[PDB]
Symmetry: C2
Subunit: 306 residues, 2 copies
Amino acid sequence: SGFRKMAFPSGKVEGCMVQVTCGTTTLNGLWLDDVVYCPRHVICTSEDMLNPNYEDLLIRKSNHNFLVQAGNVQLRVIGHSMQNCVLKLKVDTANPKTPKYKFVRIQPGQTFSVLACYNGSPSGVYQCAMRHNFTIKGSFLNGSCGSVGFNIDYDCVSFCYMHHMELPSGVHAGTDLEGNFYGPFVDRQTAQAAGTDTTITVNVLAWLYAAVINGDRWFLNRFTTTLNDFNLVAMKYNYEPLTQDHVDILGPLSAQTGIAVLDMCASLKELLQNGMNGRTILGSALLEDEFTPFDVVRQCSGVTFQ
Amino acid sequence: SGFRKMAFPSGKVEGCMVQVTCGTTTLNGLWLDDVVYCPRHVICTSEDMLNPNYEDLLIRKSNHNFLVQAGNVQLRVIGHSMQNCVLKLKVDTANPKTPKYKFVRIQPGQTFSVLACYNGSPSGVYQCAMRHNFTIKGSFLNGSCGSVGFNIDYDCVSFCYMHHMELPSGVHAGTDLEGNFYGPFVDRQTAQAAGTDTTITVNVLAWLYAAVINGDRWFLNRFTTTLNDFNLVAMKYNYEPLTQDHVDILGPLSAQTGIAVLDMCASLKELLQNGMNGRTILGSALLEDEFTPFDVVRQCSGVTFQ
């Protein structure tokens, strides 16, 4: 028992992180097979970032201008290509430590693990969620660009995120591994507002299920509700409207706990209206929304990876 | 910027986890060099755990009764020894993936990363702290025993924790890697009460520094205080008494922020007396105490490991 924000074991991704330098700029790349993936803004100076023309900046770069270092090993770049907001560097050596992998573009609400890296070296691992406004709330300092987010399934690593920017508000923006940003963000040092950060309702419900499984039952109430009545409340508190797909995803947890989804929604309603009255749920004094239904089933049934 | 509970990258420890089976019991071991370390209660049935005589139970076991599996590889056990509450199994093969490592016994307040494992396979990684009552607040299901806690420094993995028990209250107890339990706990299925779980004051202060570094400044107040006056408050709220060693450890963070330790203590005081009035600090609605001063300096200056 107990319930923790828990990352995937990072070892498969550690073995893929390299350092990429171009002129004076150093950041992280991901070395899968014989291709190194990195933020295209590796070709930029501090000044370029104010208003980069990436196509023009890229012209003044050749293969040899990209230094790729895996630990101390220097990799040889024999080809480069810009794909959306990421550079692909062809190298002469396949990564021996390449795992089974896929590139996925995730939907808002889905969670993943970040391996925060500096100079091609891993420093730490934490969980986060793709927010409904296409930001993440990470921990990223200068040099962290190219750090990646992922999920693991048995032996397959699904990369879903590459870190590119911090917005002036201090939240984080980046791309999938095809180089398309999540949301409206651009790789330019200009003003960019996020948008309303709505709570991921289906995640909060999952976490309520988790609490119940773990003996934290005080918030269960006598009431039920309707999808429409609940959603009236959700919309007042900037909660994502709950859909019948959401109800479906919560079915297994409903089944294990014997608590119908809508009963759980009525508990949520009363929490939103009355607050927590200074109590906690699973050691938090606010409603947590960065656990997916899958995250809870995982942690509650001890799923394992190779 | 941003501040997250962040584990060490787990890859060095992944490569050390094996599965240990003895009769009907399976749990995790740690394979360092040619020795496999595991909870001695691997020799116990469910019934034995009510009142085990480990010395007597161990007599009816030979080398061949310990099956050790690293992935699919079966390791050969050529020697066994019980040291406190852990078994050491000598195997005929040195772990090729053995890192530089040490065994450390940590002090209350210190944090570490847990790699939660089942059947010798890693499922996830999270941070926790050794509490002042020698428990940890983990996430552990059946089969998790032998999962380890650690810290990394450059290339050296310091193991400080092996998971052994869940107490009837649902918190977690275990040993250092010499097999000595943290606290008064025993490897027997009997009633065991934890003790008062006091807040780790020096950690809360660190996390206040962290918040300030990250722009969360609302709780800074006009006041200062004294060690004795603060401690009068700490003792009322079940906070660890702050010592001058604590003040010393916070010096670098005091220096970076220009906020004297005792000014920060007076802010804490007012938080303890007035609550948070429904605001948050670094996205929490309560005072967090599982970041060490070191943890904050780490995350705030991007320290890296090989």
